[PDB]
């Protein structure tokens, strides 16, 4: 079955950092799953000191589509637990900087981590033989090195750039890496000639919109800020930060022409003294007020591209290649492939039958057909997409 | 005379970034000064688009002790102007990141910058021969390399860690570097045996206090945040940031025991959702509520040390060596030397007669005597300091 890697290391000061994906896989589980995680994941619940975490909020559970697991739900899976001694040692090897330690976890092999993973996997039965694929919610060269030795693939899976309530929920599934080192551009290059999409970028954007767009005083430049310690601002940012992104824009625009939107999930908000601060209810209403958008690698950059805004992308990300194409035609085709073939309907990356489907490395046409079938729960590759858009049209 | 280096490069998006020091040297000038700067410094005034800058606020002028220069005041100095073409080229050589470019300016030689400096200095008269010393408000290996070739010293000068209205105004003057690569520890090591201070750390703190201390619900841990793009968070931080500093503390304390104070000058403030946020009127009232303090390299770390608080200093800074001494005795002696001999009364670093004094590299006893004479505008080195403290006592 699946071997789901959810490391317990509190790089950003939060225990069980990926608890929500632990609950989601448990909720959707149809067969037994091997969880490679930490005891923090198994004890967080019956810890009255953490009962206020957002993962326990009924609104968050309903939005992500999971329910809290019970004793029975968990008893049907196998659990391997990583110890904290390695984490303490890791911090001591990077000058006690937890963020730099996180960066090494995301971008370098850690031999001591590989040793413990091998030991855990070799600790029982034919655990290794039962493994059809690894799943990791982030890049992890330690795990990926172990996977090569054992002949297993690594699916990198995470929530996608389009999310409810504004959009249909999407997710990433990438065999090379998630956010950084992605294979979206490589997949597109191989089937680019198979795309003749009779729709505009706005039509593709409209297909994923679940709401009526906001009410269409422009700012010349909009600046998207991100969560300061998110993995793709730590590892895939090309050294840019929120503050150097702001300086970058101020080299090109006077502060009176800049509109800044802080990430609603950041610990930091902006003072009103310097820039004009955005107070929009959503990121779409914000970029609509801007003539061009600047981002490191926020999901919002995709929104700007799909709405036809001049967009600068300074960091590595899965959608950047769409922005690097000359000519409207190729850009629409690249966006269509990205949205219907690279992105996955959110629930499907937690579906074991779908994961087995992707493990066979099927053709892009079959992948698109699976996604549209799901989106359309109510022929060439372009025919599938053109007809899907057209049926949504009327 | 003096050759004052005030570069015009808007690394942080602000033109004439050190305009206030330009006005201060002009205001206190008794002789002709050579200014190596940019045209932005000379035109900012009669630019109605910048008349709201804080350097023009009468309260800021009175606090820093300068008045706006007029046509006559400036006509008695010589001006060399750096061009912007180099800045544009510099940005293109660091992936258009202005903050990374700033870092290179602070920490690396830039041959093209050295060439332009040499050309400017060689552009007229015996400009070079009239130069008694360079003054730089930041570390600049480009300028320091030029200085070596020409046989000139470089005084690194900046506002100090103790400032009005809470304290007597102080400044740095350091021949090796300011903030980073400082010589405070080296100077202390040479005369440590000459210090037998009959006062406590609180007594030294009281000497520089100009106000009555605040009214003495403790938090186990206080976190000092800094301005995100200040030079000593860009170049001398050992890679730490505000966000990794927070994670560092969260590895040791639960959020309920952490009190966070954002820098009043930062563009960012903190949300109320996670940590307990400090709303003190000053940094002293904040650290008084904490049992131990954490900082990268804020001036506030010195305050914590002088008030006897357990202090963690993660970045490079001039006062760190005080915190690395074992035993209360040596710590008080180190603090006394730092405060009376390393730190300079603010006005004196703009006084040409005092600068000439320091250019002779006098003995630590003479330096302390000059500073106490200034502080006391109303004998061994320890006798000078002990008597100064005692006279302030009664
Ligand atoms: N500056 C920002 C960044 C993100 N966001 C919201 O957060 C979601 C994910 O964004 P990141 O990839 O930037 O975390 C986006 O779809 C958008 O809904 C926002 O509203 N403003
Ligand atoms: N978190 C912080 C940082 C600085 N400060 C104020 O700013 C002045 C200089 O601090 P930095 O060296 O941190 O810029 C300090 O003396 C203190 O008065 C504050 O009040 N809170
Ligand atoms: O979880 C993270 O480290 C990050 C990964 C990004 O792909 C993205 O999911 C981001 C979220 O948008 C944070 O809200 O967090
Ligand atoms: O000006 C800077 O880059 C910095 C230097 C520090 O020594 C310190 O002066 C700091 C100020 O406290 C910022 O308010 O700014
Ligand atoms: Na991405
Ligand atoms: Na739609
Ligand atoms: Na310092
Ligand atoms: Na005093």
Residue numbers in the entry:
A (entry chain A), B (entry chain A): 1 to 216, 219 to 380, 390 to 405
Q: Could you pull the original sentences from the published paper?
A:
Kdo addition blocks further polymerization while creating the epitope recognized by the carbohydrate-binding module of the cognate ABC transporter, allowing export prior to ligation to lipid A-core in the periplasm. The evidence presented above strongly argues that WbbBGT99 is a retaining glycosyltransferase that uses a double-displacement mechanism analogous to that used by retaining glycoside hydrolases.
The WbbBGT99-D232N variant crystal was grown as a CMP complex, then soaked with a CMP-β-Kdo-generating reaction mix for five minutes before freezing. For both variants, clear additional density was present that could readily be modelled as an α-Kdo with an unambiguous linkage to the anomeric carbon. After refinement, in the WbbBGT99-Asn232–Kdo structure, Kdo has a 0.7 occupancy, with ADPs similar to those of surrounding side chains (suggesting around 70% conversion to the adduct), while the resulting electron density clearly defines the positions of all atoms. The Asn- and Cys- Kdo adduct structures refine with α-Kdo in a very similar position, with only small shifts (0.29 Å r.m.s.d. for Kdo compared to 0.24 Å for the protein), with the largest shifts in the anomeric carbon (0.6 Å) and carboxylate residue. The most striking feature of the adduct structure is the dramatic reorganization of the Kdo group relative to the CMP-β-Kdo complex, with the C1 carboxylate moved furthest away from the leaving group phosphate, the exocyclic O8 group closest, and the anomeric carbon shifted 6.1 Å from the leaving group phosphate oxygen. The carboxylate group interacts with Arg12, as well as Ser233; in the WbbBGT99-D232N–Kdo structure, the hydrogen bond is to Ser233 N, while a ~30° rotation of the carboxylate group reorients this oxygen in the WbbBGT99-D232C–Kdo structure to instead hydrogen bond with the Ser233 Oγ. The Kdo O4 forms hydrogen bonds with Glu158 and Asn179 (as well as a structured water); O6 forms a pair of hydrogen bonds with Arg163 as well as the CMP phosphate oxygen.
